[PDB]
Amino acid sequence: ITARTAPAGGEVRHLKMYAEKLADGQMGYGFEKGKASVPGPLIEVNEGDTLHIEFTNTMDVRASLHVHGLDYEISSDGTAMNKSDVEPGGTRTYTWRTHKPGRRDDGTWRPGSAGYWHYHDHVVGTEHGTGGIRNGLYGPVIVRRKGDVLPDATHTIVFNDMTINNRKPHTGPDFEATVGDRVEIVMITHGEFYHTFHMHGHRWADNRTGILTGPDDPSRVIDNKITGPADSFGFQIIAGEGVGAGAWMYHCHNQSHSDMGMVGLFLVKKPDGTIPGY
Amino acid sequence: ITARTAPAGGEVRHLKMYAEKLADGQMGYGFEKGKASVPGPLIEVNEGDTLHIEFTNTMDVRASLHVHGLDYEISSDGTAMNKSDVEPGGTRTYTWRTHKPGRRDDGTWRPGSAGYWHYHDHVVGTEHGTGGIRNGLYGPVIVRRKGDVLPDATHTIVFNDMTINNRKPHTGPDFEATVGDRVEIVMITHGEFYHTFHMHGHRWADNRTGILTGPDDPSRVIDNKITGPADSFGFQIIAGEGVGAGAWMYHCHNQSHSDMGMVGLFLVKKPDGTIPGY
Amino acid sequence: ITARTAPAGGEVRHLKMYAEKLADGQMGYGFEKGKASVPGPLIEVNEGDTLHIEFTNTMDVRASLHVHGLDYEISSDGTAMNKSDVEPGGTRTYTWRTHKPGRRDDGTWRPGSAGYWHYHDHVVGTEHGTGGIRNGLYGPVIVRRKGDVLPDATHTIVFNDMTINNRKPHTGPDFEATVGDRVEIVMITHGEFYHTFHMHGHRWADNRTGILTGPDDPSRVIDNKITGPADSFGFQIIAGEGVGAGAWMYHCHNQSHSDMGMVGLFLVKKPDGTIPGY
Ligand SMILES: [Cu+2]
Ligand SMILES: [Cu+2]
Ligand SMILES: [Cu+2]
Ligand SMILES: [Cu+2]
Ligand SMILES: [Cu+2]
Ligand SMILES: [Cu+2]
Ligand SMILES: [Cu+2]
Ligand SMILES: [Cu+2]
Ligand SMILES: [Cu+2]
Ligand SMILES: [Cu+2]
Ligand SMILES: [Cu+2]
Ligand SMILES: [Cu+2]
Ligand SMILES: [O-]
Ligand SMILES: [O-]
Numbered sequence: 001i002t003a004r005t006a007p008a009g010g011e012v013r014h015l016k017m018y019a020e021k022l023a024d025g026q027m028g029y030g031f032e033k034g035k036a037s038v039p040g041p042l043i044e045v046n047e048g049d050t051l052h053i054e055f056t057n058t059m060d061v062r063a064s065l066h067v068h069g070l071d072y073e074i075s076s077d078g079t080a081m082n083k084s085d086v087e088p089g090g091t092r093t094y095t096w097r098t099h100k101p102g103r104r105d106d107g108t109w110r111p112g113s114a115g116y117w118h119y120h121d122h123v124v125g126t127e128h129g130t131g132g133i134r135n136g137l138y139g140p141v142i143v144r145r146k147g148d149v150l151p152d153a154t155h156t157i158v159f160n161d162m163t164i165n166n167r168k169p170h171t172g173p174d175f176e177a178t179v180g181d182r183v184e185i186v187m188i189t190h191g192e193f194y195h196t197f198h199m200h201g202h203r204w205a206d207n208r209t210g211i212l213t214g215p216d217d218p219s220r221v222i223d224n225k226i227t228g229p230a231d232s233f234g235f236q237i238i239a240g241e242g243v244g245a246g247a248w249m250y251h252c253h254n255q256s257h258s259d260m261g262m263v264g265l266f267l268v269k270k271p272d273g274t275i276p277g278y
Numbered sequence: 279i280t281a282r283t284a285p286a287g288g289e290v291r292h293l294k295m296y297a298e299k300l301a302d303g304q305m306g307y308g309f310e311k312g313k314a315s316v317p318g319p320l321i322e323v324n325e326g327d328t329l330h331i332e333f334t335n336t337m338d339v340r341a342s343l344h345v346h347g348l349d350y351e352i353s354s355d356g357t358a359m360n361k362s363d364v365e366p367g368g369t370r371t372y373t374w375r376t377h378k379p380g381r382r383d384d385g386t387w388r389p390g391s392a393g394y395w396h397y398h399d400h401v402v403g404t405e406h407g408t409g410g411i412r413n414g415l416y417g418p419v420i421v422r423r424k425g426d427v428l429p430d431a432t433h434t435i436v437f438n439d440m441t442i443n444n445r446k447p448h449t450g451p452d453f454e455a456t457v458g459d460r461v462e463i464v465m466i467t468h469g470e471f472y473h474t475f476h477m478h479g480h481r482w483a484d485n486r487t488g489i490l491t492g493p494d495d496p497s498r499v500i501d502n503k504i505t506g507p508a509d510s511f512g513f514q515i516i517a518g519e520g521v522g523a524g525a526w527m528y529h530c531h532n533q534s535h536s537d538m539g540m541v542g543l544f545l546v547k548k549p550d551g552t553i554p555g556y
Numbered sequence: 557i558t559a560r561t562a563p564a565g566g567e568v569r570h571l572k573m574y575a576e577k578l579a580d581g582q583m584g585y586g587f588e589k590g591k592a593s594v595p596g597p598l599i600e601v602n603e604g605d606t607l608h609i610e611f612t613n614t615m616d617v618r619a620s621l622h623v624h625g626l627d628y629e630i631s632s633d634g635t636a637m638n639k640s641d642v643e644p645g646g647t648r649t650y651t652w653r654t655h656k657p658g659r660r661d662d663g664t665w666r667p668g669s670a671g672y673w674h675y676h677d678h679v680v681g682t683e684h685g686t687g688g689i690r691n692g693l694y695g696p697v698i699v700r701r702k703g704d705v706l707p708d709a710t711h712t713i714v715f716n717d718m719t720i721n722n723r724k725p726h727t728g729p730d731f732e733a734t735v736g737d738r739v740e741i742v743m744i745t746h747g748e749f750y751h752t753f754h755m756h757g758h759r760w761a762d763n764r765t766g767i768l769t770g771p772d773d774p775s776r777v778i779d780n781k782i783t784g785p786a787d788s789f790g791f792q793i794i795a796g797e798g799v800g801a802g803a804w805m806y807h808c809h810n811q812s813h814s815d816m817g818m819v820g821l822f823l824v825k826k827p828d829g830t831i832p833g834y
């Protein structure tokens with residue numbers, strides 16, 4: 001493999017993160033005060049890293065940080081129950097650990113942390129973060145296993161209730177690549193609805209990484225993936241591979257939902273920068 | 279493997295296809311004028327084939343042909359956007375290509391086109407084909423990989439909203455096999471609801487082919503599969519294997535939906551043609 | 557592998573089961589009169605066993621026993637249609653067989669019975685057991701393959717409409733383990749809704765067993781699984797592995813559904829019996 005690939009992990013990474021009410025009513029995470037996004041920033045680590053997140057709640061309401069998939073002690077699951085949210089103005093230090101796979105003493109095989117995970121609020125609105133997740137307190141987390149191929153870029157599509165990334169219907173987001181780019185999608189669903197994520201012209205493998213190890217990988221290859229609240233998958237595609245450049249739609253294939261605007265564009269450009277048609 | 283298996287692909291195939299309003303209000307595809315069906319005809323090819331479809335719209339409205347999974351350029355994705363539908367009376371030539379798997383130059387592994395796919399309209403009713411798909415403009419596409427086991431017969435069950443194959447509730451379809459037949463099911467969902475497809479007395483592997491490579495295939499074996507709009511999967515079973523002949527129901531296991539009528543019969547006969555019970 | 561593992565099967569097992577109206581209006585299955593439970597008792601067998609269930613309906617209404625996944629002749633599919641339910645006061649003898657995987661004469665590979673399955677009523681309320689299932693006529697079935705790891709304990713969570721195990725919202729069930737226990741979960745959905753089962757602090761493999769065979773298993777590793785009516789999966793976890801003890805929430809991650817009360821606790825204790833927090 002002469003493509004770039006992930007290194008063995010085991011570093012202790014530190015991070016500042018803020019919850020911030022946005023002028024428009026929404027709430028978002030950010031790494032800097034006043035640079036909050038919906039989705040929140042992508043956090044990426046290698047199997048075996050440890051992440052110390054110094055989380056500061058700049059909001060007038062309790063708020064928390066709860067993560068999927070990664071190892072965390074109960075002090076860091078970010079629930080009101082476990083005395084683990086953060087009161088307004090407060091600052092708490094969450095710790096996410098990750099681990100590689102390997103045999104346990106009993107001879108069984110321990111799964112690693114690798115995957116396409118995500119984080120979100122667990123206290124705003126309700127004791128399950130329905131308000132926070134609605135207002136935009138979610139973001140993607142990627143844990144790489146030593147060897148995973150690394151992309152040219154990662155984009156995060158989040159189906160949150162009837163929106164993509166908390167955007168007005170029929171407003172994307174759109175994305176751009178050039179034919180041949182290795183594009184990584186992190187696809188997260190939040191809210192109370194079920195969806196099917198469809199991408200024109202492209203397909204991935206329905207497994208951990210969206211990529212086939214080689215000729216023996218039995219994983220189904222799909223281009224429509226059903227998805228429900230707190231589901232998260234990811235994949236990599238070669239932009240326009242086998243199909244050329246174009247304005248390739250992605251959308252929820254639920255007919256009412258795409259009709260109601262859950263649609264974006266994967267704009268794959270010719271090397272001259274043009275998109276055929278469009 | 280003394281069963282029949284798919285040959286290596288690489289042919290160029292031509293096809294005439296028609297969209298047509300049916301006397302009863304629906305719309306269907308067909309290979310011949312006046313011989314249209316809902317679901318539309320099955321297109322089946324081998325990885326590496328190329329398919330040229332001379333599509334002719336015999337309807338008074340714009341209509342298109344959009345396919346999943348297969349390689350196609352943006353001129354053949356059948357969206358209004360990409361100037362790719364077909365106006366009434368018009369005739370466009372869509373091209374779908376397919377490719378085998380193999381190593382890329384970066385050493386990664388490119389997935390092949392093989393799968394259980396489908397094609398449907400993308401412009402009738404809405405810019406997402408909500409009307410076409412509701413009326414019947416959908417059909418199955420099978421792409422086989424060299425060596426795939428070939429069935430004795432394929433059948434197509436489509437859960438389109440609260441119907442099976444656009445049939446009035448509580449009216450099938452029913453299918454027939456003799457015990458021991460290798461039956462292939464192609465299972466497509468369309469519309470705005472989510473379903474679970476259940477078959478009595480039979481089970482398959484939740485992977486690309488519904489069939490386990492052999493002793494090492496980790497794929498889960500299931501008899502109930504959740505399924506959302508534009509989801510498509512397929513499998514093969516041995517009719518009555520281990521259970522003998524009978525009127526074996528298949529249905530959406532959603533309790534309200536099977537109540538409202540999404541039920542059919544897999545009628546597996548003894549050699550004498552009789553169904554125990556029934 | 558120095559953990560306990562399932563033996564090769566092939567025994568002929570016998571069983572008495574009862575359907576029982578419960579004082580509070582529900583219906584339950586049991587192994588003894590007056591000892592019925594919702595969910596019903598867990599039947600567990602090895603690939604190759606045969607199970608003869610002497611089912612006795614003690615209710616004023618027709619009721620049946622229909623099983624997923626296992627081999628059964630149409631005489632024992634428990635549908636009104638195939639004259640296979642049981643009249644009030646009646647006693648039928650259902651038979652479920654299971655088989656191991658192996659090569660067929662055509663050289664294809666026949667799947668084994670192994671899996672996380674379930675049984676439920678098929679005639680109470682409607683011709684599809686909608687009333688039976690609503691009232692609690694469902695229970696889990698585990699078919700083990702020779703070699704499967706055996707757990708320290710199994711627990712069954714059933715999402716039946718807006719309830720867990722037919723319990724009043726916000727009332728568990730809760731379970732307890734001690735850090736390090738090998739806990740098996742059998743997860744079944746019933747009714748008319750779709751769900752996502754999430755579990756704090758833990759993760760399993762989305763395959764047949766929830767466990768990775770070793771370093772080549774491509775199976776996604778998840779902590780949130782979408783689940784529809786009559787869907788059934790299972791897994792094992794090491795209680796608090798990598799995360800220590802705590803009141804570990806599990807719930808439907810559907811924001812409205814967990815809000816409405818589909819929540820339980822996985823109470824993982826230290827040897828003290830103490831739960832940090834709680
Ligand atoms: Cu939670
Ligand atoms: Cu949707
Ligand atoms: Cu498409
Ligand atoms: Cu969550
Ligand atoms: Cu589309
Ligand atoms: Cu349904
Ligand atoms: Cu069944
Ligand atoms: Cu489509
Ligand atoms: Cu049934
Ligand atoms: Cu739910
Ligand atoms: Cu969680
Ligand atoms: Cu069932
Ligand atoms: O589509
Ligand atoms: O069933």
Ligand SMILES: [O-]
Nearest residue numbers: 066122754809
């Ligand atoms: O959560």
